[PDB]
Design a protein around this ligand. Sequence first.
Ligand SMILES: CC1=C(/C=C/C(C)=C/C=C\C(C)=C\C=O)C(C)(C)CCC1
Length: 284
Amino acid sequence: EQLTTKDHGPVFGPCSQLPRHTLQKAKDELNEREETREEAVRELQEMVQAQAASGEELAVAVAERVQEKDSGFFLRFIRARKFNVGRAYELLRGYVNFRLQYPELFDSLSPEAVRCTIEAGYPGVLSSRDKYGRVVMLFNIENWQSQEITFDEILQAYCFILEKLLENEETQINGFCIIENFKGFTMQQAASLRTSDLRKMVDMLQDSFPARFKAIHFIHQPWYFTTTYNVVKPFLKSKLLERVFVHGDDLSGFYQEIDENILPSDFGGTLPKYDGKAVAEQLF
Ligand SMILES: CC1=C(/C=C/C(C)=C/C=C\C(C)=C\C=O)C(C)(C)CCC1
């Protein structure tokens, strides 16, 4: 506690320093500034290739994909698995595995086509971190039309925005936090949701990307959100479930976690209605 939303560095821009006591926070996930980081990455690659030297298909796939990756890359996986090399490696396995199970989201990807979606505002990204230093990602389902923008395109956007934002060590340590504006959620939309797609999302969220998803928030959901929650509820591991938060309209427990002050009008905040063009530009 005793940490203001401001205390944390900029979203988007590669980190510059470790101040703002976040470095200590990481140390509290068993991090050591002194001798660990350097070796861990080594150990991982030593493990990556070792397990690929067995001839096993996956461990090999990994070895190929990561054959040309800076040390900061591998650190992303170390940081996310609490500095457990083994666990860290497993995240790398599942990480590659995801791309394999889901070709469409990474194969014909066009840097141009993606920008279109991100400018469209799906998803959104708060230009600011919450009081914890977490990238607050946004989605506003109101007026969404699945025929115009595919649930896939929206996920591909997530993937890009993750690959990018994860270049920032601050983000790596504070994690993410998603806001879900289900105010415009229609029954026509609820039934238009492929369970196959929902798993795709869930998968992204679980043991796929080297991120710390700390909280999912839902707001203004209809009385039938329970129907859609119960469909996904089986997929979510305990850790993630305990992090899903449905506030309804009583934000007297919501605004403590997320400061109304940094939120666009779209999500009950003071700021101007979310701008996709602004965000997208900073991306590229
Ligand atoms: C309830 C539940 C989910 C379902 C989200 C809804 C049903 C998705 C619909 C629109 C999309 C594209 C929004 C993207 O931000 C998750 C995320 C699987 C896991 C968290 C708990």
